Each structure stands twice: as C-alpha cells, then as structure tokens.
Amino acid sequence: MDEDTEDWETQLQANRDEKDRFFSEHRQSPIPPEERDDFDGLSYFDPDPDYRVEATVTVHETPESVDLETSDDRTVRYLHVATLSFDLDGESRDLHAFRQAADESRTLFVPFRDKTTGQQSYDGGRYMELEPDRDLSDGDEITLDFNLAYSPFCAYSDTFSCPLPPESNWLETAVTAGERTDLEH
C-alpha cells in the first residue's frame, strides 16, 4: 500500500491545490455569497484510504448522451464511455464514467448519490472527478477516491441545471470521510 499511496499523496498535494484554485481563480467562486460569507473553500473531504477503492473499467464502444454540469454556469452533454465496478460496503457497487465529447485531458466525471446526500451533505448527490495515469480501456483498473469528492456547482448555485445521474450510480451506503457540510446551518 505505502508504495502507491506515497505517490497518491504526491498527486494529492497538487490535486487539492489545483482543484481549490479551479473554484477560486480559474472560475469565480460557485459557493453562494451567503454560504461563503461564513465559509471559505471548495467543500472537501479529508484524505481517507478506506474511501479510496479500486475498480475494474468496463468501456462501452458506443457511448450514450448523459447531461451533466460544467464550471461555466451551463449544462453540457457527456458520453458514457465506461462503468467502474468496485467493492464498497460488503458488495459490488458501480459508478459510470463519462466525458463531454472527445476528452483526452483524462477528465472522467463520475456522479454517486449516497446516504449523506441531503443529510450529512447537500442534496443532488456527491460528485467526483478522476484524472488517471493514461486513457482507460476495457480491462484496466482505476482508483475511486470518494474521500476527494468535490462540492458540485449545482448544489451550491441553483442557476446550474443539476446533472442527470443513471439509477445504477445511486449507492445505498453512507460516504462519511473527513469533514462534512451542514446544509442545515
């Protein structure tokens, strides 16, 4: 574990830092004027290896059109290129990996709606983004860090039409890692 996980920390000190300034410098803060009045940051779970899981990539050769959110006050069509099957909470869970049109910036966007959605966290789901070492094909593996699941633009700003996640990525388990986010302030 320690061999790949020290490298997971190498990518992570850069990860949390570049994602933070994606929400601050790249795009202006999606966190409401009301919310960020007391709070300041991309709502972030603290690095937890138990919510760092391993999944087998199942790549679909003919991708369907799935509307998900972007960082540009907009909603954009993604293509269903993969499904990531892993173990979590005593059974095999699956999360579908999409990318807008013909992405090669490694930017895989996976939604997962769990038990903390609208309870221990804000409603809409928990949204997670992977950028692997390479491009994934049927048979590859990929690491799903739910402990790095980001604050979605939709759940914070109602001016974003919220993504449309398939029934298959709805997880019947709680993802509690690091700090939470109190929607009921």
- CA dist 80 and 102 (Å) reads 11
- CA dist 130 and 100 (Å) reads 14
Both tokens of 166, joined, read 């398939």
Give whole-number Cα distances, 96 to 47, 135, 171, 184, in Å.
22, 15, 12, 30
The answer to whether residues 82 and 171 touch, using CB atoms and an 8 Å cutoff, is no
Q: How far apart are the first and last CA of the chain?
A: 38
Give the CA dihedral 32, 71, 53, 8, nearest 10 degrees.
-100
DSSP state of 35: H
Experimental method: NMR
Total residue count of the chain as it appears in this document = 185
- CA dist 57 and 137 (Å) reads 7
- Strands 52-59 and 75-88 come out as antiparallel
Question: What residues does each domain of the chain span?
Answer: 1-40, 41-185
| Helix or strand (DSSP H, E) at 142 | strand 141-145
The answer to whether residues 112 and 95 touch, using CB atoms and an 8 Å cutoff, is yes
The answer to whether residues 131 and 106 touch, using CB atoms and an 8 Å cutoff, is yes
- CA dist 64 and 164 (Å) reads 13
The answer to whether residues 5 and 48 touch, using CB atoms and an 8 Å cutoff, is no
- Strands 108-112 and 52-59 come out as unpaired
97 alpha carbon, distance to own chain's centre: 10
Q: Residue by residue, what is the 3-state secondary structure of 60-110?
A: CCCCCEEEEECCCCCEEEEEEEEEEEEEECCEEEEEEEEECCCCCCCCEEE
Amino acid at 176: T
CATH topology of domain 1-40: 6.10.250
What residues contact 64, with CB distance under 8 A and at least 6 apart? Answer: 79, 80
Give the CA dihedral 115, 170, 89, 144, nearest 10 degrees.
-110
